[PDB]
Amino acid sequence: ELSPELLRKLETLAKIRLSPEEEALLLQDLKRILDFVDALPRVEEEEALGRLREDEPRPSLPQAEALALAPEAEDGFFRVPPV
Amino acid sequence: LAHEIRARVARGEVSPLEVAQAYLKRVQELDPGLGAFLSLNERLLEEAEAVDPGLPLAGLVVAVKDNIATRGLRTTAGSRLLENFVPPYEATAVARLKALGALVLGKTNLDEFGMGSSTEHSAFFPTKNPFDPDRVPGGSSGGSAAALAADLAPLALGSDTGGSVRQPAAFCGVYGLKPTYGRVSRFGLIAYASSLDQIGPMARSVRDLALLMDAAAGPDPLDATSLDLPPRFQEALEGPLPPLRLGVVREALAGNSPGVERALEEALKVFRELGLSVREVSWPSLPQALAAYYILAPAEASSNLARYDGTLYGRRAAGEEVEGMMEATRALFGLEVKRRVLVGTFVLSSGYYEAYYGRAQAFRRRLKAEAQALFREVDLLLLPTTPHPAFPFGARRDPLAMYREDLYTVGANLTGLPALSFPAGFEGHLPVGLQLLAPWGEDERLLRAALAFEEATARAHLKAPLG
RNA sequence: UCCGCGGUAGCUCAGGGUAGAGCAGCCGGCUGUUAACCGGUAGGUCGCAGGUUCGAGUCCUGCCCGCGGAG
Ligand SMILES: [Zn+2]
Predict the structure, then answer these.
(1) B221 C-alpha to ligand 1 centroid (Å)
(2) Which of A57, B48, B200, B216 ranks highest by number of CB atoms within 10 Å?
């Protein structure tokens, strides 16, 4: 129950551009997988024990160390292609 | 052998610097063929090995899976997206080992983003099994295991999400522990299924596992899902039941290879002569868990790997358009990753969320329940880590066949239970492993049990020489 | 809005080579039918408008309509 259209829709939502060769390939894989998973039986279905962090400041990264990860930087900014 | 080294070091018989030089050489000579390490801790090792004293882990050096953050060292996660990424921070687990004298030897090879069961999905290269160069070391922590079995390192860190620590450990005939979900910090783990991921120790002896866990585990203010439970592992100074009840899982008894069935029977005889009440129990929906996993995990994976566009730190694919750039950069993912995150997007996508995710969630809650009920009648659970020993490269062409590698290991993560994988024999020079389970938080107990087994025999071998 | 099944005689639904069957209708038969049935016969915008094909209810592009399903 998986149309080539859905793949397109999915690859769109995931922002993943695959080659027409891979599309035909993944199309077969996804089918088999989604069939295997769909075999899962349906079944009928806790206490909140989470914690909170205190509003106390913790030292930040030095601007240098941060921008060192960036593929492109400019005057202390992360630089990306324009919208 | 790890605790043996620290012993020689504390008595002045050897210096940490000596131990490093020894291991560094062995790696430089054996790794080329093995392909266990991706990166190596450069001059910062020799330098760091000559500026330490008499701490608990001084002379020890650790091989870390390359999806675990190490400040100043290349942490690729076995992906092209991050093949030049170097973290400005350190993983909490790793940080703790470092503060006790330990040092990182290098970074271990893995399947891209931990999604794989053979290492054949590493963006860089496959890893070879020291017991048979024609067969896989398992995955996704294949590198760490391979490194241990060849004594390329005394200690090792891995990552488990569906058995990514146990399955490799079995294939390579070493110990692999997946700690109760919450025991070890996830901060610094380039993880893919947040609800299932856990850093796991691996070593060649159970006493060594204790060393790692005792150091690595513990509450971390940075991880909101970490448990406030003091390790207390090295208290494996046994006052061990005698008489624990052990429950064997029927569902995992059929479909096993000769060597696994054989190794299983023998283990039972051993636990009985140890004072345990062995009984067969039922894990009703265990066989259907594999499915629930490959819909819950991919779901979280899509959202976790969503951050990898070329904007702030990954590789940039070169689009010049941004949407186009993001789209082209993510195309650098491998076939397996794409496959999973496409599944993950579908399961969460509109019209399919309740029909799939909601479904698998309710089923995940069943397993925990059925497990609670099982540990009301038994104290431990036993099953194979895998139905067979390491397979030869090339098999598992069908993506599904690869998934079914984690048939017995998915239950641990889905529930959160601690699971230990210990060596239990050989299907003809091939290491076969067995899997022990305990109730939540009773990590120390199954290790204790593991000791008894280990001591009751001495059955563990090294494919390559050990220094 | 999206998705998945539907739209064929009047009614309810069968199916890459005269478009079919039973219900009722028409003609013929039958004195106890309960949804009578036997024979013969009539009955069409195959959703609508565009393509592939020698040939399209059947396949493939768009739209209208109905039912159902999604946090
Ligand atoms: Zn911050």
Answers:
(1) 14
(2) B200
Q: What residues make up the domain containing A59?
A: 45-83
- Same domain (yes/no): A6, A18: yes
For B33, the token pair is 């063929």
Ligand 1 centre and the CA of B463: distance in Å? 46
CA B352 to C1' C38 (Å) is: 56
Q: Reported resolution in A? A: 3.0
Which of A21, A40, A45 is the best substitution to test chain B (most B C-beta atoms within 10 A)? A40
Q: Are residues A40 and A57 in the same domain?
A: no
d(CA B301, CA B146): 26
Dist CA B228 CA B161 (whole Å): 21
Gap between the Cα atoms of B62 and B102, Å rounded: 7
Q: Known catalytic residue: B25?
A: no
Same domain, A39 and A27: yes
Do residues A51 and A19 both lie within one domain?
A: no
Chain A, window 24-83: residues with a beta carbon less than 8 angstroms from a chain B beta carbon = 25-26, 29-30, 32-34, 36-45, 50-51, 53, 61, 65-66, 68-72, 78, 80-83
Could you tell me the domains of chain B?
1-467 (3.90.1300.10)
Do residues A60 and A22 share a domain? no
- How was this structure obtained? X-ray
> Is there a contact between B241 and B375 (Cβ–Cβ < 8 Å)?
no
Do A7 and A40 sit in the same domain of this protein? yes
